[PDB]
Amino acid sequence: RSGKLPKAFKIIPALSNWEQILYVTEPEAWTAAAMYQATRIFASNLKERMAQRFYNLVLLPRVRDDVAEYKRLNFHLYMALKKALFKPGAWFKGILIPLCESGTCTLREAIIVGSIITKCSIPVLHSSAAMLKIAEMEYSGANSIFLRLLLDKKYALPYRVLDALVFHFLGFRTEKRELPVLWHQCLLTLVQRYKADLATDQKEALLELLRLQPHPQLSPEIRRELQSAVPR
Amino acid sequence: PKKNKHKRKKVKLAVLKYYKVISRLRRECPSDECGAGVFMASHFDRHYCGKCCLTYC
Amino acid sequence: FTYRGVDLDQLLDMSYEQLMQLYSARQRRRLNRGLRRKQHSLLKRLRKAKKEAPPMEKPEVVKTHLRDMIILPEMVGSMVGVYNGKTFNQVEIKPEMIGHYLGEFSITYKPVKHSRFIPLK
Amino acid sequence: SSVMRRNEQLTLHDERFEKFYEQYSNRLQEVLNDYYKWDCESICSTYSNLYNHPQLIKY
RNA sequence: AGUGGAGCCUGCGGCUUAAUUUGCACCCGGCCCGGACACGGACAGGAUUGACAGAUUGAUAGCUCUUUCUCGAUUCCGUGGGUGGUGGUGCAUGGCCGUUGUUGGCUGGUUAAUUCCGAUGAACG
Ligand SMILES: [Zn+2]
């Protein structure tokens, strides 16, 4: 619940055989505050790779079955997951992207950890790498929130990243599946933030993308954002 | 009774205390992970290493 | 002073196991059930506070919530301020305070301290 | 990758992405040893109304 | 037969009280964390992260008060009657349950015991 933690638990960052130590500690059976302190000490004095391994093995199933059980996130696990965001690269490669290729991510998980993304200023380079990687893999109902909020981060976008994004949207050219309102919201955020970095061919390509896949509510906004855009 | 958050003391030129002019003004921790620059905090009764929690008294 | 015919000096010399034979039935039952970690902690704290006290006047104040603490004969002369829920009350430990709990000496409630019509027409 | 590209306007940054997509003891003994009356209405009763009267001009 | 009389107990009022919760909810103290957007500040001269020891404290604690060691952009200060999101809530909305027959088919320790735990399928209407 609370109090000082024992000194035999703060030595696991300095202990080589961490796997058997965490295995003997009954991996299905801590509480949330123990996760908060453990993630604090495994993101504070620990290096990148084994912290990523900790994120892959322990933190992701814990947050997943917690939000599967209570349909929300506990306070202490939320604080732990933010303290995992204190190390950007390990948390992206250990929680975020494994949840992306998990394929079973729901809207609640995506919106919660995307809000966690929103509340912290992440580095531009490695986030742009994450942009490219989330652009390469397939579209579900969860990664769209990540696209929308990460474009709402409003960082200096690299142009290989923008090429990957427009390549993805050209990948959504001739599909007949009913795109959500949030898809048009993502497109609106992109054409609101990075309309200046789009060349004329990108503008017209998004124009027939608007033509073949229209929206009675949000497509005129994308139309007027494309038509009132000043290039570089 | 509001709990104010702790603020780190912005000390002026924290680098400029371990060197002269050459040598190391503070001790070096002899551990495996720490060394060749990990200077050694010299409190009025002890010495501490700020990375892997070495303790000398 | 004397307590059950026994003076304070050999009371301090008196052992823990047969100290119960002069105490009351509730007292003896509690000492049979043994003092827990908080009580031993406050015993050590009181002994420490009596340790560096200057040898002419009484030691400093030790404050606690332990209302279910019993006064033991070693505590005689300590300055203890026990909680009543809102504030701390400081009390002497007198030799004749031996059979009573600490919580008796800080009362948790304040006492209760609590034009006819005549027709003119 | 793609086929339609920048063609203009000042590529600043070089997009180092190769480390991302292709990525995927006496101390223990010594810490083991270390382990082991008035209110706002009634006050109006004490106010006087007969001290600082201005001069009255009669008719 | 009583109650209304008396003592005690209890329920509503009222009085005291920090609270005497209400048609553990109450009180006294100590932790934890509390948006982005816009603009103006500090920031590699270094923003910020972790920390031993001692203490404050009813108690201990880098979650606090001293003493400098380390991590380095993973940043942190202020003002908005501007939105708001781990919010609460209703409607249309796609999938999925339950709802309105018939015949077959043992490594281990443990107990009085084929005892206990422990590993471990088919058709017909
Ligand atoms: Zn070191």
Q: What is the DSSP string of A119-140?
A: HS---HHHHHHHHHHHHHSPP-
Count up the domains in chain A and report the number: 1
Q: Cα–Cα distance between A131 and B24 in angstroms, integer?
A: 45
Domain that holds residue A219: 1-232
Resolution to 1 decimal, in Å? 3.0
Whether the Cβ atoms of residue C96 and residue C1 lie closer than 8 Å to each other: yes
A50 closest CA partner among A24, A15, A82, A83:
A15
Name the amino acid, one letter, at A44.
S
For residue D30 the two structure tokens come to 């010594």
Task: Report chain E positions within 7 A of protein CB atoms.
Answer: 14-20, 27-38, 45-53, 58-65, 67-77, 85-88
d(CA C114, CA A22): 65
d(C-alpha A125, C-alpha C72), whole Å: 69
Q: Cα C97 from chain centroid?
A: 7
d(CA A23, CA A230): 57
Whole-angstrom distance, CA of residue B14 vs CA of residue A186: 46
Count CB atoms within 10 A of the CB of residue A184. Answer: 19
Q: A45 beta carbon < 7 A from strand E? A: yes
Q: How far is CA C88 from the centre of its chain?
A: 13
Structural domain boundaries of chain C?
A: 1-114
DSSP secondary structure letter of residue C83? E
3 state DSSP class of C62: strand
DSSP state of A174: S
Please classify residue A108 by burial: count the beta carbons closer than 10 Å to its beta carbon, then call 0-12 exposed, 13-18 middle and 19+ buried.
Answer: middle
- Strand E-contacting residues in B 12-51, CB cut-off 7 angstroms: 12-15, 17-18, 26, 37-46, 48-51
Q: How many CA atoms lie within 13 A of A171 on its CB side?
A: 13
Distances A104 to A108, A141, A186, C2 between C-alpha atoms, Å: 12, 9, 21, 80
C-alpha–C-alpha distance, residues A136 and A120, integer Å: 24
Residues in chain A with CB shorter than 8 Å from the CB of B52 are: 14, 45
Neighbouring residues of A63: CB distance < 8 A, sequence distance ≥ 6:
A73, A77, A81, A95, A109
Side chain identity at residue A51, one-letter code? A
Q: Could you give the CA distance from residue D9 to residue D6 in angstroms, rounded to a whole number? A: 8
Task: Check if the beta carbon of residue A115 is closer than 8 Å to that of residue A81.
Answer: no
To 10 degrees, the CA torsion angle through A56, A59, A60, A62?
140
Whether nucleic acid strand E comes within 7 Å of the CB of A15, the answer is: no
A197: amino acid identity, one letter? D
Rounded-to-10 torsion of CA A107, A110, A113, A116: -80
CA distance A186 to A150: 10
User: For residue C115, which amino acid is it?
Assistant: S
- Name which of A188, A131, A121, A192 is nearest A159 in CA terms: A131
A10 contacts on B by Cβ (under 8 Å): 53
Q: Kindly list the strands in the beta sheet with C61-64, ordered across the sheet, starting from the edge strand earlier in the chain.
A: C61-64, C79-83, C88-92
- Both tokens assigned to A228: 């009132």
CA distances from C30 to A213, A228, B18, C106, D31 (A): 81, 85, 60, 21, 38
Q: Are A150 and A120 in contact (CB under 8 A)?
A: no
Instruction: Return the ∠ at Cα B39 (arms to B38 and B40), rounded to 5°.
Output: 120
> Which residues of B have a CB under 8 Å from any CB of A?
33, 51-53
Question: Cα C25–C29–C30 angle (5° rounding)?
Answer: 120
Please choose, from the candidates A134, A229, A214, the residue with its C-alpha nearest in 3D space to the C-alpha of residue A178: A214
D and A in touch (3+ CB pairs within 8 angstroms): yes
**DSSP H or E segment with residue C89:** strand C88-92
Query: CA-CA distance, B2 to A16, in Å (whole number)?
Result: 42
Mutate to test the interface with A, among B52, B54, B55 (most CBs of A within 10 A): B52
**Going by DSSP bridges, is the β-strand pair B41-43/B46-48 parallel, antiparallel, or unpaired?**
antiparallel
H/E element holding A91?
helix A88-91
Q: Which residues have CB under 8 Å from C62's CB, separation 6+?
A: C42, C45, C46, C49, C78, C79, C80, C81
In this structure, the number of other CB atoms found within 10 A of the CB of residue A138 comes to: 10
Look up tokens 């696209």; give the residue. A147
User: How many Cβ atoms sit within 10 Å of the Cβ of residue A94?
Assistant: 26
On the CB side of A65, CA atoms within 13 Å amount to: 8
The separation between CA A10 and the C-alpha centre of its own chain, rounded to angstroms, equals 29
Under 8 Å between Cβ of C67 and C102? yes
**What distances in angstroms separate CA C94 from CA C61, C78, D25, one per listed residue?**
15, 9, 56
Which residues are paired to A215 by β-bridges? none
